Structure formats: structure tokens, C-alpha cells
Amino acid sequence: GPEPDMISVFIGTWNMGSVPPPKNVTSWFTSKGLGKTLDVTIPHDIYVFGTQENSVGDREWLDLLRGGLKELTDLDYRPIAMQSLWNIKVAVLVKPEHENRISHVSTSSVKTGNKGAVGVSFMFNGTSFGFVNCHLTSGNEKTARRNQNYLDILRLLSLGDADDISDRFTHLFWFGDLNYRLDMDIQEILNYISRKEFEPLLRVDQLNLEREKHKVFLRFSEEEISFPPTYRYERGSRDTYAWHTNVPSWCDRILWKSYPETHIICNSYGCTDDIVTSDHSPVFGTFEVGVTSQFISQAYIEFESIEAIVKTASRTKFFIEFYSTCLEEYKKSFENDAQSSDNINFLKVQWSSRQLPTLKPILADIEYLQDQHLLLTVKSMDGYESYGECVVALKSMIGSTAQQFLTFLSHRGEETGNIRGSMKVRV
């Protein structure tokens, strides 16, 4: 009980339109405006600010953010880190008291016009966080290029540390001017916007469509959108869309991907309507997020069997590597001892208990172990390349009797099958 079990995280994304911001951006910080909004006078534990087309210097911009929070909260928020890629910038600020809870800070950037992404990662006690702020390709017809920018960022971002960042963090937030547009005629768009009927517009949102096709943001969630398209506004008010062609669109988005059986709840998601220097409106999202401090405040993990369904026609043997922060070093299986055809595109590979390792956690405490996760990777014996990664929560696995886990494999932005197994955690 002495340490935090839960924190409140603010994420903001704002394309500043290459002009100075207004002195007062308080509405952004406080989730005031349109959509799912707040009233709450209680400052967040962490503020993450992502910006695009930001012409304010790195230091000056950080000073504006600290000064604004100081004015709002009377606390001096501490920069954990900041990363810029020319006019694409991200800053993470934290309440003074959490300074000593932060460790393993990392930053990275990927350039894909200035387009690309900047990232920050760290641990908060035993829980890891990643934040990716991006500006993807512009224009209604450039969906394929946006998708490719996403894949390049995913592949090249060197945050944390696996093959890519998608499974590296307990909670991964990806936000920015993703630049996906509405696939609809201007007249219909404007009619739905005036009547405040966003559901028919969301049906033709290109990001939603590409996510459903499994091209981008595998495993990510986004909160329901109840606020109007944030692009493209005439400057100086929010009365008019400048569409002369740039149809109104939800360019500016916040998404997340979390490890299984963790606590995360979106408390707000919306845009401001009183910040008018840019052709985009700022977007805010706030989250209540579980944090594990059990390590701060003999055990064995055993496997009776594992069965993977893997996208491949290879006749090579396979093994599994097991990684976790609760282990001194990773472990690996022997080769699979049975194999068969699942489908025309998939093989079934099976490891009996004989082929599988016994993992030995760093601490034997039951509450500690309940908050841990294992990263499993299926690799070929010929060349050692990965065919799929997944994450398994220990939460429901504590006992003398083996229980089943079931989850899904991915690799390099593709779904590559599934994995089912029988395990137990003994203390």
C-alpha cells in the first residue's frame, strides 16, 4: 500500500500549423471542449505533449509547458525527457514526487515536408510506458503512403530494450497528426457535422477502415469519437472549415495498446474549441493506468505443453524464447516434438513438457508474480528468425493446477497465428 497502485496520464496532440501558439492553452491541459471532457481540478501524474508543425524552439516550448502547468497546479513539473525531429516534438512531464519512481528513460526518432515520429519510454516503478508522437503523409488519396510510414516507424523506432516496439511496453500510446481522412463527398460531410451525427462519418474514416483491414495499428484501441473533425479550420475561430480539396477529417488521434489483464480506462477524449491559432484543434486524452510497485513494496513457472499455429510452409523445427523483467535472463525451449498441417497457410507445432524450460522468477511473492508478463517468441532452428511474438499475463495463472492461456502471434506488423498452452506458477 505505500506506493502508487494507479496513476492518471494526460496525452495531448496538436498540429500547431507553423505559427506561434496563444498564451492561454489551459483548455488543452484540462480536457475542456467537445467530446468526452472533464470539469476535475486534480492535476495528472504525467503529462505527455505531442506536437507537429511546431516552430517554437525545443527549450522555449518546454518552458511554456512547465510554466502553464505551474500556473494551473502550483507544482513544478519535471521534464523526464523530450525528443524533436525538426518541427515534430514530444515532451513528458511528471509531478516532482515521482522523480525517483522513473527509470530506464529512452528516446528515439524516425524520419519517413517533414514527416516521421519521435518517441519517449521509461519505467514507472515496475510498469513500462512508451509514447510515440507522429506526423504521417498528408492528402486524401495517400492512404497507402500513411500505412507505409506507419510500418517504417514501427520497424525503425529504437525505443526501450525483441524485434519491434509493439510488445516492448506494458502500455504503448501512439498519437499525432496521423492524417487519415473521410472518404465522403463534402456536402454529406457538412450535413452530418451540422446535425452532430458523427457515426455515419466514422463509418468512412480511413484510419478505422485500414485498422479493420489489419494494415496498421494491430491490437490498438481508440476511445469512441464524439467530437467534430479537428481539421481543417480557418484560423481565428472554429466557425468555419477551410475545405477549398481538404474535406473535414479526424486527422488528430490518440491510440493505445496494453499488455493483457492490466488496468487502463480512458477518462477523456476530445478537442478544444477555444484555441484557434492553427488549422487543427488540439486533442486531449486522459487515462487511469495501473502501476505495479510489488517488487519495491523459491517460485517456479512451469509448462505442461504449448501448441502454436504459425503462418509458414517451412519444414524446419521451431523453438520458443521466454523473456520477462521478472527473470534474471531469458530461457528457451528445445525444438518442437510434433508438427502437422493446420491450413494451406499455417502449420501446427507442438512442444510436450519434456521440451519446455522451468522459469525462476526474481521474487517468490504471490502479489508480485500476479502483476508480471512473459514475452514468448517462436523462432526457426534454421537461421533463428522470429515467426511471431506474444505476451502472456501471469495474473490468473497462480496455483498448483495447470491452466490454459490462449493468445495471438504477430511479427513485423502482420498477424502470424496463435498460441495455446498449459501453465502454472508455484510459490
Numbering used by the authors: 418 to 456, 460 to 532, 539 to 587, 592 to 674, 683 to 735, 745 to 874
Task: Give verbatim lines from the article.
The SHIP Ptase domain belongs to a family of Mg2+-dependent inositol phosphatases with specificity for 5 P dephosphorylation of inositol rings. Here, we report the crystal structure of SHIP2 containing the 5-Ptase and a C2 domain (Ptase-C2), revealing that the two domains tightly associate via an extensive interface.
In order to disrupt the hydrophobic core of the domain interface we mutated F593 and L597 to aspartates (FLDD mutant). Crystal structures of Ptase-C2 FLDD confirm that few hydrophobic interactions remain intact between the Ptase and C2 domains. The FLDD mutations also disrupt interdomain hydrogen bonds between R649 and E862. We note that the FLDD mutations increase intrinsic Ptase activity with PI(3,4,5)P3-diC8, but importantly the presence of the C2 does not cause any further change. The PS-mediated increase in activity on vesicles is maintained for the FLDD mutant, whereas as with soluble substrates, the increase in activity due to the C2 domain is abrogated by the interface mutations. Removing the C2 domain abolishes observed SHIP2 activity, whereas the FLDD mutations partially reduce activity of the wild-type protein.
